[PDB]
Design a protein around this ligand. Sequence first.
Ligand code: NO2
Ligand code: NO2
Ligand code: NO2
Ligand code: NO2
Length: 129
Amino acid sequence: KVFGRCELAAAMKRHGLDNYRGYSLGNWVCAAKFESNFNTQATNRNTDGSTDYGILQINSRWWCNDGRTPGSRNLCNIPCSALLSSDITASVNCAKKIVSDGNGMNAWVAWRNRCKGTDVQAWIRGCRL
Ligand SMILES: O=N[O-]
Ligand SMILES: O=N[O-]
Ligand SMILES: O=N[O-]
Ligand SMILES: O=N[O-]
């Protein structure tokens, strides 16, 4: 599923991401835009053999089991395919564990490079929130 900007904003808010660990809703929408272009089916291979899955491009190295990242962890206790569903529950719940890990949203390379220190509020402008 490819979400609309305000559609994803509303879903993320409903799932309790707005101001989660102090990160406003705009930060999460911005991260999703640059990680996956709002596409739940997005996948990208990393150099180390791991893969990033879903709207927030969650890594099989630590967070999910994709059956092909030998020696990795499954800290969110899910198959990586759950992260590709049209329902974003699994992605949001795993993202909450990631952002709590100690580095905050810096865990997302795209957020650090493209969202951090910018007017992230613009990502929710015009939406019926
Ligand atoms: O959900 N369309 O902005
Ligand atoms: O949720 N406004 O960044
Ligand atoms: O991602 N464990 O193969
Ligand atoms: O739960 N909204 O994908």
